Symmetry: C4
Subunit: 152 residues, 4 copies
RNA sequence: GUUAAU
RNA sequence: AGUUAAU
């Protein structure tokens, strides 16, 4: 009668031994919301250093701690580009008044976000061929926008 | 704990430093409804402008029809494809089926459906068509698209 | 956090107006019900993205009107209707309806021929519309009408 | 009127004969939750004996582990692949850090991940793999995974 | 004041 | 010609 906890996380695999509900019509709403988020997560994953996070991997490479190799930093960066969308960014861009230096940085990250969609495999490579000084300011500019869009 | 705002937009990338909740079970319903919409926007995008950004697509098309704001024909054919891909042919067919037959509005309802459909299969070759097509009639196929676009969303 | 009124263009997908639209495009400020319908319009775009007299009818009506040789249907147009209908049925649902009735029963071969079409067509609708464009008109009508009723069976009781 | 039960499960196909709502703007919010789950299940399915249906994939695997129900190795590998695709790597890395250094359980956790990932990339060759492992080693992989599956979902 | 799917 | 957004 209660919603099956496995169904909530995707799909019950316990055949007919399972006496919990698999009928969405019978489910309270929270279970239908929670289930939609595990399912979207699966659907998104199907279309392709751990306690630091991708962010702490990038904050460490800028700062040269925790021995982060440049290769491991462009892989992280690729992941952080996929979490940003270019329209939240184009809204930021056209609230900065004209000729502000901050417009060119905005368009620069957009080109990488867009290049990363088409193919994250060669977008990593275009980043490695950057020299670190400029790679690290690019990295720190996309960090700043990440915190900015999301918090405040 | 409160729901991690990075998680609401996708997936937190802050590792264990982040002490907000990443557990959908604890979240209030609004954060789950919001996250779902950020997530569908992301799924949809992953299967595929010089301060005319303020006009929008619709403002670029309406300035082109009226020959104002320096909207060249090329950038209005591009914008016309954007508009096509946002209409859904089904709710045109809906409207076309509410009219008496041999009303002239029916033949307008089918040029749009052929355009939204030709644009879905090939967005570009459809653009090709649009930019060779004499500005006279393109401007009324645009104004017809733009009227359907509005009326669908006005009840 | 403060509630606003939602852009009804954005509710149906993406607003194309720009800084001219003075309605909310920020989901953090919409009321629950607007977040609920957006998702439904957005799921229809996603699904559509990876797949006049006849629309009056519908697919069931153009299929039903084939059982009575009515409204000048064509075998070609009644088979497209059928695939379109199979892609609407779900392959795990008639496996429920096939594991409840007694063994050596006369309604398992229909099921398993439905199961055998539901997913012989999940692959492509070219080989499966031909797979019945050949089947005889007698067996067609009855086998077209066999899925029609599993369709309303599943959907109501 | 009440929402069309055919549109709840997808796309009503009755044309204009249908006397129920097809307008999401008018629906009670529960029907829109349900429809989304029905459509999520469909979006996801479109990205690819039989009395074993009663058993389900877990029935089938428990059965193999205990030499019950005449379950061939092929059939327990298939089902092990399906069991894998229902697991997500991130949930168990959550636990791999909750462990202590040089536990045994860090060895098992690492191994199922290698299987999830290979199962994602090529599920047909992960099955080919599982069907060459020593029968007893296969069954403990299987038992470990079943147990991870169980407590992922029931252990807060 | 002027704009408005207030 | 007042309440709500935008200037
Ligand atoms: Zn269950
Ligand atoms: Zn808008
Ligand atoms: Zn209906």
């Amino acid at each position: 009668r209660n919603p099956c906890k496995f169904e909530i996380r995707g799909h019950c695999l316990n055949g007919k031994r399972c006496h919990f509900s698999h009928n969405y019509f019978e489910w309270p709403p929270h279970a239908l919301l929670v289930r939609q988020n595990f399912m979207l997560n699966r659907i998104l994953k199907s279309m392709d250093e751990y306690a630091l996070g991708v962010v702490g991997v990038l904050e460490s490479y800028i700062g040269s701690i925790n021995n982060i190799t440049k290769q491991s930093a462009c892989v992280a960066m690729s992941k952080l580009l996929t979490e940003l969308n270019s329209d939240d960014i184009k809204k930021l861009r056209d609230n900065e008044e004209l000729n502000s230096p901050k417009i060119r940085v905005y368009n620069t990250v957009i080109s990488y976000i867009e290049s990363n969609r088409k193919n994250n495999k060669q977008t990593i490579h275009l980043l490695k061929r950057l020299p670190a000084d400029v790679l690290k300011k690019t990295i720190k500019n996309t960090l700043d926008i990440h915190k900015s869009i999301t918090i405040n």
